[PDB]
Design an enzyme around this catalytic site. Structure first.
Site, PDB file in Angstrom:
ATOM      1  N   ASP A 125      39.698 -31.501 -24.575  1.00 31.99           N
ATOM      2  CA  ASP A 125      39.765 -32.454 -25.676  1.00 31.99           C
ATOM      3  C   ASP A 125      40.253 -31.776 -26.953  1.00 31.99           C
ATOM      4  O   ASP A 125      39.678 -31.974 -28.023  1.00 31.99           O
ATOM      5  CB  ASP A 125      38.403 -33.118 -25.910  1.00 31.99           C
ATOM      6  CG  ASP A 125      38.501 -34.407 -26.733  1.00 31.99           C
ATOM      7  OD1 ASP A 125      39.600 -34.989 -26.809  1.00 31.99           O
ATOM      8  OD2 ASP A 125      37.469 -34.837 -27.311  1.00 31.99           O
TER       9      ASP A 125
HETATM   10  N1  LIG Z   1      29.992 -24.985 -36.634  1.00 31.33           N
HETATM   11  C1  LIG Z   1      29.971 -25.969 -37.540  1.00 31.33           C
HETATM   12  N2  LIG Z   1      29.983 -25.639 -38.853  1.00 31.33           N
HETATM   13  C2  LIG Z   1      29.945 -26.617 -39.761  1.00 31.33           C
HETATM   14  N3  LIG Z   1      29.901 -27.940 -39.566  1.00 31.33           N
HETATM   15  C3  LIG Z   1      29.895 -28.235 -38.263  1.00 31.33           C
HETATM   16  C4  LIG Z   1      29.926 -27.339 -37.209  1.00 31.33           C
HETATM   17  N4  LIG Z   1      29.954 -28.010 -35.996  1.00 31.33           N
HETATM   18  C5  LIG Z   1      29.945 -29.275 -36.341  1.00 31.33           C
HETATM   19  N5  LIG Z   1      29.909 -29.484 -37.695  1.00 31.33           N
HETATM   20  C6  LIG Z   1      29.911 -30.749 -38.422  1.00 31.33           C
HETATM   21  O1  LIG Z   1      29.558 -31.795 -37.529  1.00 31.33           O
HETATM   22  C7  LIG Z   1      30.707 -32.633 -37.279  1.00 31.33           C
HETATM   23  C8  LIG Z   1      30.710 -32.995 -35.816  1.00 31.33           C
HETATM   24  O2  LIG Z   1      32.056 -33.282 -35.409  1.00 31.33           O
HETATM   25  P1  LIG Z   1      32.503 -33.332 -33.904  1.00 31.33           P
HETATM   26  O3  LIG Z   1      32.731 -31.991 -33.324  1.00 31.33           O
HETATM   27  O4  LIG Z   1      33.701 -34.281 -33.864  1.00 31.33           O
HETATM   28  O5  LIG Z   1      31.274 -34.025 -33.165  1.00 31.33           O
HETATM   29  P2  LIG Z   1      31.062 -35.446 -32.477  1.00 31.33           P
HETATM   30  O6  LIG Z   1      31.436 -36.526 -33.423  1.00 31.33           O
HETATM   31  O7  LIG Z   1      29.610 -35.470 -31.968  1.00 31.33           O
HETATM   32  O8  LIG Z   1      32.023 -35.372 -31.213  1.00 31.33           O
HETATM   33  P3  LIG Z   1      31.829 -35.998 -29.744  1.00 31.33           P
HETATM   34  O9  LIG Z   1      33.267 -36.462 -29.360  1.00 31.33           O
HETATM   35  O10 LIG Z   1      31.043 -37.341 -29.973  1.00 31.33           O
HETATM   36  S1  LIG Z   1      30.979 -34.709 -28.626  1.00 31.33           S
HETATM   37  C9  LIG Z   1      31.899 -31.823 -37.793  1.00 31.33           C
HETATM   38  O11 LIG Z   1      33.003 -32.608 -38.231  1.00 31.33           O
HETATM   39  C10 LIG Z   1      31.284 -31.106 -38.992  1.00 31.33           C
HETATM   40  O12 LIG Z   1      31.143 -31.975 -40.111  1.00 31.33           O
END
Ligand SMILES: Nc1ncnc2c1ncn2[C@@H]1O[C@H](COP(=O)(O)OP(=O)(O)OP(O)(O)=S)[C@@H](O)[C@H]1O
Length: 287
Positions: A125
């Site tokens: 992805d």
């Molecule tokens: N390592 C990190 N450092 C800082 N912020 C983070 C980190 N990981 C996630 N985030 C924050 O959390 C958000 C989660 O975004 P995604 O990775 O798109 O998660 P998601 O919306 O749960 O994706 P899926 O498709 O549903 S698994 C990011 O855009 C950041 O704002």
């Protein structure tokens, strides 16, 4: 010690995900600030997968895993903190990213993705929201829920995690496992759209979509209509990448050639790693 709140301090919320609130945190008695993904337990298969794929990885372009906790009502995933925003945000905020920035970003992504593939891990992805900027720079692959080992049945993996526990609480929604491993259609390679498994080559297709979008401001194939989007991916050559603002520099012929090799609909014609690394767009970065 096994108790999350005895090991970490929470500061402000910094983001949200599916069934997830993300915090800035810190391991107690340290200066190590971290990102803490506070997660509904129903996401245990996705989080288990993320941990099992990345737990031993240390690479500049991959978000480092640190810890995984479970308390009464949540899972807590502790990973490397990224403060620079997502690549989606960067593309939305910075109109007409110059080609030299696209090359540098490309070098970050190639370095992280090649490492993943060398370990036998497909990201599956690749998308701008699943890449975060560490600080002023350095792109990191930042979400491994939907990643897998080459040739693995991720649906079966998720079902196995669910079975061994057995997290649903009193929720009645029956979400198919096929639904849970589903990624962004905008970046799905045509052979996968037609039913083939993810591969190293389909990751390279998605990489080509990303580079295209970084330069032009828009993915090469886009529609709000899922059926229109599939037809575009399967049947339509992408338009030449132009900066959104037409007054900015056009793409070099090397950049155009690279995108043509990556956006081959037939995977047998798509660039493979060795040819990709040796491409002139990189200006000998991988010599
Ligand atoms: N390592 C990190 N450092 C800082 N912020 C983070 C980190 N990981 C996630 N985030 C924050 O959390 C958000 C989660 O975004 P995604 O990775 O798109 O998660 P998601 O919306 O749960 O994706 P899926 O498709 O549903 S698994 C990011 O855009 C950041 O704002």
């Amino acid at each position: 010690n096994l108790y999350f709140q005895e090991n970490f301090i929470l500061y402000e919320e910094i983001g949200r995900g599916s069934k997830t609130v993300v915090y800035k945190g810190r391991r107690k008695g340290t200066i190590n600030f971290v990102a803490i993904l506070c997660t509904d337990k129903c996401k245990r298969p996705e989080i288990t997968n993320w941990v099992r794929l990345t737990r031993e990885i240390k690479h500049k372009n991959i978000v480092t895993f640190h810890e995984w906790y479970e308390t009464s009502n949540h899972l807590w995933l502790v990973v490397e903190l990224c403060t620079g925003g997502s690549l989606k945000t960067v593309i939305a905020q910075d109109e007409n990213l110059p080609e030299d920035v696209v090359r540098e970003f490309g070098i970050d992504l190639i370095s992280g993705l090649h490492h993943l593939h060398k370990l036998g891990i497909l990201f599956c992805d690749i998308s701008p929201r699943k890449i975060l900027l560490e600080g002023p720079g350095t792109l990191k692959f930042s979400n491994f829920c939907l990643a897998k080992v080459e040739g693995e049945n991720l649906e079966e993996f998720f079902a196995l995690v669910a079975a061994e526990e057995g997290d649903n609480g009193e929720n009645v929604l029956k979400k198919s496992m096929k639904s849970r491993v589903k990624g962004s259609p905008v970046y799905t390679a045509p052979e996968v759209v037609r039913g083939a498994d993810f591969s190293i080559s389909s990751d390279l297709w998605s990489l080509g979509c990303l580079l295209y979008e970084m330069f032009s401001g828009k993915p090469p194939f886009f529609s709000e209509s899922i059926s229109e989007l599939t037809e575009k991916i399967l049947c339509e050559d992408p338009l030449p990448p132009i900066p959104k603002d037409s007054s900015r520099p056009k793409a070099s012929s090397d950049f155009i050639n690279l995108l043509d090799g990556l956006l081959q609909r037939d995977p047998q014609k798509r660039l493979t790693w060795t040819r990709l690394l040796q491409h002139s767009f990189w200006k000998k970065a991988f010599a």
